[PDB]
């Protein structure tokens, strides 16, 4: 048994950088239709990223992005079962605001909300608004996040923080109400420091799936995450990001995938700088018939450490539909559902 989440397209064209991919703006209403459909098929959770700058090109890839906390507050108000995670880009929001936003969406969702904390990698995302802390930051970002999360822990735990460190000073800082349920914190650290951070403070860790149709290729990463979690004695499983390109037969899925790679938007792709393709940022990709994708996802579920998968689709509305109608009923690790 394995948890499934949907990575909601808060950015235009989702995760495909291609003139042959579906072209779409991220709107509330689309994300709404996506999450209500995921929920209908008993997806366990929905997460949006935050992305403050695009990559340009013919497709203007990720030039158009909604903001994660307000989007997930809206989706919380129109759902009732699915878990909801927003991403805080920690350089952009003071911890006490994040603490109170999380409490607010706790209230909207009736205890279904959590937070994905990220340090921020993309210097231009922060440079553009004059808030990059210098090149000190690459090396020091995990100390920063350590202080940040301590402030949140105090606020969610007791309503109050006196935390004092290098980057934050609380003087009897107050946030009430406190979340109705223990606030879940997720992290996406791949590095050593990142995994050490997650081992100490996260409920689980997002990592990248690897290769095309090589479902268990990420297994070493999940092994290191599991090793990091032994060092704190805490249960911090891996959730693995894959793109699913599924169809009636393997041939048809492969034709879609090739069709996408053909239209690659090379102009957008320069700004980012059986093989994985940059057309989906070299994402772990599963391409096949419904049954073949079911089988490969079953393999992911057997990797030590792996507690779930976070899924993108080439086409979200019909991809979630076919996943739910054709893939999920064939998956051993989902036989527990209605």
Ligand X SMILES: O=c1cc[nH]c(=O)[nH]1
Confirm or reject binding of residue 189 to ligand FMN (CB under 6 A).
Answer: yes
Residue of the chain from 19, 36, 92, 190 that contacts ligand FMN (CB under 6 A):
190
CA 297 to chain CA centroid, nearest Å = 18
Confirm or reject binding of residue 255 to ligand X (CB under 6 A).
Answer: no
Q: Which residue is nearest to ligand X (CB)?
A: 49
In the bound complex, what is the minimum distance in angstroms from residue 159's beta carbon to ligand FMN? 28
Is the distance from CB of 150 to CB of 157 less than 8 angstroms? no
Confirm or reject binding of residue 49 to ligand X (CB under 6 A).
Answer: yes
Confirm or reject binding of residue 92 to ligand X (CB under 6 A).
Answer: no
Confirm or reject binding of residue 99 to ligand FMN (CB under 6 A).
Answer: no
Confirm or reject binding of residue 71 to ligand X (CB under 6 A).
Answer: no
Q: How many other CB atoms sit within 10 Å of the CB of residue 63?
A: 17
In the bound complex, what is the minimum distance in angstroms from residue 148's beta carbon to ligand FMN? 14
CA distance 307 to 221: 13
- Residue from 260, 246, 271 nearest 325 by CA: 246
87 binds, among ligand X, ligand FMN, none (CB under 5 to 8 A by kind): ligand FMN
User: What DSSP string describes 218-287?
Assistant: THHHHHHHHHHHHTTT---EEEEEEEEEEESSHHHHHHHHHHHHHTB-HHHHHHH-----GGGTT-EEEE
Subset of residues 254 to 313 that bind ligand FMN, contact rule: CB under 6 A: 310
Nearer to ligand FMN, 188 or 331 (CB): 188
Tokens representing 298 are 């079953």
Subset of residues 50 to 69 that bind ligand X, contact rule: CB under 6 A: 51
Subset of residues 278 to 297 that bind ligand X, contact rule: CB under 6 A: 281
Residue 23 CB-half CA count within 13 A: 8
- Residue from 327, 313, 290, 314 nearest 42 by CA: 327
Given the rule CB under 6 A, which residues bind ligand FMN?
A: 49-50, 87, 89, 118-121, 188-191, 194, 206-208, 241, 310
Annotated binding site: 50-51, 116, 125, 141-142, 191
Annotated binding site for FMN: 50-51, 116, 125, 141-142, 191
């Amino acid at each position: 048994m394995m948890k499934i989440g949907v990575f909601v397209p808060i950015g235009n064209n989702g995760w495909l950088i291609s003139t042959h991919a579906p072209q779409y703006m991220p709107t509330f209403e689309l994300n709404k239709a996506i999450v209500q459909k995921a929920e209908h098929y008993h997806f366990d959770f929905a997460l949006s990223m935050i992305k403050l700058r695009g990559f340009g090109g013919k497709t203007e890839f990720w030039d158009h992005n909604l903001e994660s906390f307000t989007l997930m507050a809206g989706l919380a108000a129109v759902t009732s079962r699915i878990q909801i995670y927003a991403t805080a880009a920690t350089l952009t929001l003071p911890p006490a605001i994040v603490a109170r936003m999380a409490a607010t969406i706790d209230s909207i969702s009736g205890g279904r909300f959590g937070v994905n904390l990220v340090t921020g990698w993309q210097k231009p995302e922060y440079e553009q608004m004059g808030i990059w802390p210098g090149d000190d930051y690459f090396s020091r970002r995990y100390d920063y996040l350590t202080e940040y999360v301590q402030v949140l822990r105090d606020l969610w735990g007791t309503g109050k923080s006196d935390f004092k460190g290098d980057f934050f000073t609380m003087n009897d800082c107050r946030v009430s109400p406190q979340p109705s349920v223990p606030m879940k914190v997720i992290c996406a650290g791949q590095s050593d420091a990142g995994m050490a951070f997650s081992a100490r403070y996260a409920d689980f860790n997002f990592c990248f799936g690897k290769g095309v149709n090589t479902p268990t290729a990420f297994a070493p990463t999940a092994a290191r995450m599991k090793q990091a979690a032994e060092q704190t004695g805490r249960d911090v499983g891996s959730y693995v990001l894959f793109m699913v390109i599924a169809d009636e037969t393997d041939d048809a899925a492969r034709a879609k995938w090739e069709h996408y790679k053909a239209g690659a938007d090379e102009e957008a792709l320069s700004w980012l700088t059986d093989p994985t393709s940059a057309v989906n940022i070299n994402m772990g990709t599963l391409v096949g018939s419904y049954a073949s994708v079911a089988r490969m996802l079953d393999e992911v579920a057997s990797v030590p450490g792996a507690e779930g998968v976070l899924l993108t689709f080439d086409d979200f509305l019909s991809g979630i539909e076919t996943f739910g109608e054709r893939i999920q009923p064939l998956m051993q690790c989902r036989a527990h559902l209605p």
